[PDB]
Design a binder for these strands. Structure first.
Ligand SMILES: [Mg+2]
Ligand SMILES: [Mg+2]
Ligand SMILES: [Mg+2]
Ligand SMILES: [Mg+2]
Ligand SMILES: [Mg+2]
Ligand SMILES: [Mg+2]
Ligand SMILES: [Mg+2]
Ligand SMILES: [Mg+2]
Ligand SMILES: [Mg+2]
Ligand SMILES: [Mg+2]
Ligand SMILES: [Mg+2]
Ligand SMILES: [Mg+2]
Ligand SMILES: [Mg+2]
Ligand SMILES: [Mg+2]
Ligand SMILES: [Mg+2]
Ligand SMILES: [Zn+2]
Lengths: 139, 37, 174, 130, 141, 94, 142
RNA sequence: AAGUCUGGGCUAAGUGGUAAAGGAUGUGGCGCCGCGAAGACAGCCAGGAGGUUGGCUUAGAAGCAGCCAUCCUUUAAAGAG
């Protein structure tokens, strides 16, 4: 019997077990804890892994309800050319490298999130996550 | 109160005023209250 | 920009009388006397009062807005009057009238009574709310502040005397 | 003086492409309720024309320097001008005037509208799609 | 801190401090400069403290031009010693600065960085100073 | 392209008197000409800070004449760091 | 010490606690040695976590400074994580005002007495075995 | 002893009538520049949102400990603050 809190947070598609913040915020709750695990780590597993939050609503008789999306543009770029950091010292650091259309696929998945249904404004989008880890756009 | 020869803004909410000849700082943070002296 | 050169709308009823060194501002709720710098010019006309400055150097611009605002404050005073409101917090603090004389029990070993000056008037509706209300704006402010000073708000607990509207801003203890 | 005549031409160009460009007061909504009217007037017409949102000072110079009747319905107050003839609207004003008259107290009220070339009216533009 | 690597003479007479500076009066290598408003023997320790202060301010980026050099040796008798028995020992070096002289210049640095580094650096010197920005007048010199 | 500037002939006037009245003493010259001259400082400083010594300044004389010039030399008051004197070099067709 | 008190105070009293032993475990721990005047005081050897030990050593070194018997020579107080000192304090240096009757004016006569004293402090510094009083141990170990 | 002389101006500190770095919308006077019928400046009234917790670091670091990068549609606008 907990109130009707509007559950905006920030969680990850995969990293999913009742260690904080799974507990503090979802204290005002009563839901099946290992469901953001279960359904979310499975049905949106085609892309890979990584971070996507989750929007639940609690109702007093212990009711859950949640929807989610896509691992972060900084993951969909870690499979790209083999990164698991950035390049520490970019702005000149050209570790991994991608083509103007090997960075046209990556918005096939995060397309429904911005406002750009144009994969040009959604290309330079995910290709902006490039620079803040240093992977280039060739010629 | 901070009584000094050089009184100045410490944070941007600080405000600099003149009071009885001496230069003053007043602010919503009492630590920043200064009069010249 | 510029307050002083704004003309003072003077309603029918209140009236402004220019004398040496001050202007008399009389109205529905009483009388107020406004000291005015001798080298300023107060012009009283058909339903409007205006103040004009001799020079537009800096001491004159400063006396300019001062005068016009002080007169407008007196127009509003003898017209609507002024009040401030005081909030009492704390698990035992109370106010009551016997006078009209404010009697405060705010945690001392004695209760402290405040005698109001001429005008002013005290109203204690609720026992945790006090009202200062006269036609003199600066001495409603003054006596309002006098009352709060008896027991300023606590840095650590919502305790003491508060301006209505005054934010409670606590800092942590242990 | 200076770099928003690059916006007088912008509100002269995308106004020289119409005849039924209406005006609303797009302000009081958040940013969730912002992309609401933004994508639902890009989905009740063509292209991507909900409102252009430009200065009532310069929107009055455009409707004045291109003759366009001078849509003197109400240029004061926040004014975003729903370019209804830069999309394909008609009864798409209802797509707006009801979706605004639902979420929040008086969502996206209107004030001026040019019917093809002649001036529409105030409440005679909310009923012009009812 | 700076001192000459070798000297023809160890001790030299005090001299006068008259006139505007003879040269070094225009920004010559950087974008901004700090110029002296009063004459003084600026000591090496002072120069070093001004340099470091601006360095610290440019922790990543920047060029610092030090355009005054302490070549004048500074003499002091030992303490508690009567007058006479010869000229004191060299205990340091100073640079003679007359008004108008450009003492430090910074480049490769935003305007705000430049006028803040020079402002601190002034606070380290015994003289009033003025911060200046490379002019057409420097270019003409 | 090139910049304008009003210049005026001076004679016996104290350079310092001129200078006291906001006017910068100068000399215009080339292989054919030498004239003592004075321009307004604030006027001049406006033009020089962009013309410098690379762009033709054209001097507007009170006899109507309009000479193309290059600033060949500016002498700085070391103490005040303001211009004291200006050489205007008159150009021709060689 | 410390915890229960702070459990109670940050929680206006409503926090409870219970525990049971639950074994042993590896810790990143350092041995901190305390030497006074170069000699290691075993009585004050302790052991802490490298995140904290400096702040621990930065503390004892200074409390020991305030209670050690001021000598005829300046006494160093130090803490070392094995062969490397990390925190230093110094006791005075009780001295004689050797210049007390020196209203001559001649600096050579002050130097003569000052040299001799400087030489003697060296000598008393080198062979000077300071012992920590049992009153100091109690003062540091409260 | 001799003008409370005349005309204009500055100063408000008893400065005058005992001093410096520095502080500073004291106040008078000359100039210049940026921005202001794309209405500026100050107040209030909207909004100030997305990729994205940017990458690393780290117990945690999500604009906002330290780090290097500082890049996009939505956009009237909205910094990897
Ligand atoms: Mg300071
Ligand atoms: Mg304030
Ligand atoms: Mg010296
Ligand atoms: Mg000397
Ligand atoms: Mg001598
Ligand atoms: Mg000497
Ligand atoms: Mg200095
Ligand atoms: Mg100038
Ligand atoms: Mg004696
Ligand atoms: Mg007499
Ligand atoms: Mg007289
Ligand atoms: Mg007069
Ligand atoms: Mg005096
Ligand atoms: Mg005095
Ligand atoms: Mg001043
Ligand atoms: Zn402050």
């Amino acid at each position: 019997k907990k109130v009707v809190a509007v559950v905006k947070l920030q969680l990850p598609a995969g990293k999913a077990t009742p260690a904080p913040p799974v507990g503090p915020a979802l204290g005002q709750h009563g839901a099946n804890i290992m469901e953001f695990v279960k359904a979310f780590n499975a049905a949106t597993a085609n892309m890979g892994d990584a971070i996507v939050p989750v929007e639940i609503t609690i109702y007093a008789d212990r009711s859950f309800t949640f929807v989610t999306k896509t691992p972060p543009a900084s993951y969909l770029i870690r499979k790209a050319a083999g990164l698991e950091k950035g390049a520490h010292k970019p702005g000149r650091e050209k570790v991994g490298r991608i083509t103007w259309e090997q960075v046209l696929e990556i918005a096939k998945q995060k397309m429904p999130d911005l406002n750009t249904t144009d994969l040009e404004a959604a290309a330079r989008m995910i290709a902006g996550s490039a620079r803040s880890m240093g992977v280039e756009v060739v010629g | 109160m901070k009584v000094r020869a050089s009184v100045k803004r410490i944070c941007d909410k600080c405000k600099v005023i003149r009071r009885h000849g001496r230069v003053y700082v007043i602010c919503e943070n009492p630590k920043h209250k200064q009069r010249q002296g | 920009s510029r307050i002083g050169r704004l003309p003072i709308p003077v309603p029918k009823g209140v009236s402004v009388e220019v004398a040496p060194g001050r202007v008399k501002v009389k109205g529905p709720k009483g009388e107020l006397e406004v000291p005015v710098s001798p080298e300023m010019r107060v012009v009283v006309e058909e339903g409007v009062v205006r103040v004009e400055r001799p020079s537009d150097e800096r001491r004159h611009k400063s006396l300019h807005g001062l005068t016009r605002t002080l007169i407008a404050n007196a127009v509003k005073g003898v017209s609507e009057g002024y009040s401030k409101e005081l909030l009492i917090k704390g698990i035992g603090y109370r106010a009551r009238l016997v006078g009209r004389a404010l009697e405060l029990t705010v945690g001392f070993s004695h209760p402290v009574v405040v005698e109001p000056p001429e005008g002013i008037t005290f109203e204690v509706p609720e026992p945790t709310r006090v009202r200062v209300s006269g036609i003199d704006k600066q001495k409603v402010g003054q006596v309002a502040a006098n009352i709060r000073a008896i027991r300023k708000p606590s840095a650590y607990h919502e305790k003491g005397i508060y301006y209505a509207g005054e934010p409670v801003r606590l800092k942590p203890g242990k | 003086k200076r770099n928003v005549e690059l916006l007088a031409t912008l509100k002269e160009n995308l106004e020289r492409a119409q005849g039924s460009f209406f005006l609303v007061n797009y302000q009081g909504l958040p940013a969730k309720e912002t992309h609401a009217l933004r994508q639902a007037l890009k989905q009740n017409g063509a292209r991507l024309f909900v409102a252009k949102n430009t200065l009532i000072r310069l929107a009055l110079k455009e409707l004045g320097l291109p003759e366009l009747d001078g849509l003197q319905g109400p240029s004061a107050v926040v004014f975003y001008e729903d370019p209804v003839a830069a999309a394909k609207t008609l009864v798409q004003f209802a797509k707006s005037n009801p979706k605004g008259i639902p979420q929040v107290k008086s969502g996206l009220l209107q004030g001026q509208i040019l019917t093809a070339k002649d001036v529409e009216a105030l409440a005679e533009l909310p009923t012009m799609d009812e | 801190m700076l001192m000459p690597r070798r000297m023809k003479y160890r001790k030299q007479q005090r001299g006068r401090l008259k006139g505007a500076t003879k040269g070094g009066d225009y920004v010559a290598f950087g974008d901004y400069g700090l110029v002296a408003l009063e004459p003084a023997w600026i000591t090496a320790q002072q120069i070093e403290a001004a340099r470091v202060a601006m360095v610290r301010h440019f922790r990543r980026g920047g060029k610092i031009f030090i355009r005054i050099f302490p070549d004048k040796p500074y003499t002091k008798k030992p303490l508690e010693v009567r007058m006479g028995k010869g000229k004191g020992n060299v205990e340091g070096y100073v640079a003679v600065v007359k008004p108008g002289r450009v003492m430090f210049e910074v480049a490769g640095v935003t305007e705000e960085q430049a006028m803040e580094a020079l402002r601190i650096a002034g606070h380290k010197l015994p003289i009033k100073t003025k911060i200046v920005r490379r002019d057409a007048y420097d270019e003409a010199q | 392209m090139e910049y304008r500037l009003k210049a005026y002939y001076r004679e016996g006037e104290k350079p310092s008197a001129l200078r006291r009245a906001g006017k910068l003493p100068g000399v215009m010259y080339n292989r054919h000409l030498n004239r003592k001259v004075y321009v307004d400082l604030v006027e001049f400083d406006k033009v020089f800070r962009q013309a410098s010594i690379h762009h033709v300044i054209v001097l507007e004389l009170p006899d109507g004449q309009s000479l193309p010039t290059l600033v060949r030399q500016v002498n700085l008051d070391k103490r005040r760091r303001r211009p004291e004197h200006v050489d205007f070099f008159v150009l021709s067709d060689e | 010490y410390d915890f229960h008190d702070r459990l109670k105070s940050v929680s206006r009293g409503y926090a409870s606690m219970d525990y049971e032993q639950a074994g042993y475990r590896p810790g990143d721990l350092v041995k901190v040695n305390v030497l006074v005047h170069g000699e290691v005081v075993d009585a004050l050897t302790f052991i802490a976590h490298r995140e904290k030990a400096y702040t621990m050593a930065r503390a004892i070194v200074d409390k020991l400074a305030e209670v050690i018997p001021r000598q005829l020579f300046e006494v160093p107080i130090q803490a070392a994580i094995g062969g490397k000192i990390i925190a230093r304090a110094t006791v005075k240096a009780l001295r004689k005002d050797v210049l007390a009757k020196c209203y001559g004016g001649d600096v050579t006569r002050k130097k003569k007495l000052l040299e001799k004293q400087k030489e003697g402090k060296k000598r008393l510094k080198a062979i000077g075995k300071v012992e920590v009083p049992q009153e100091a141990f109690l003062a540091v170990l409260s």
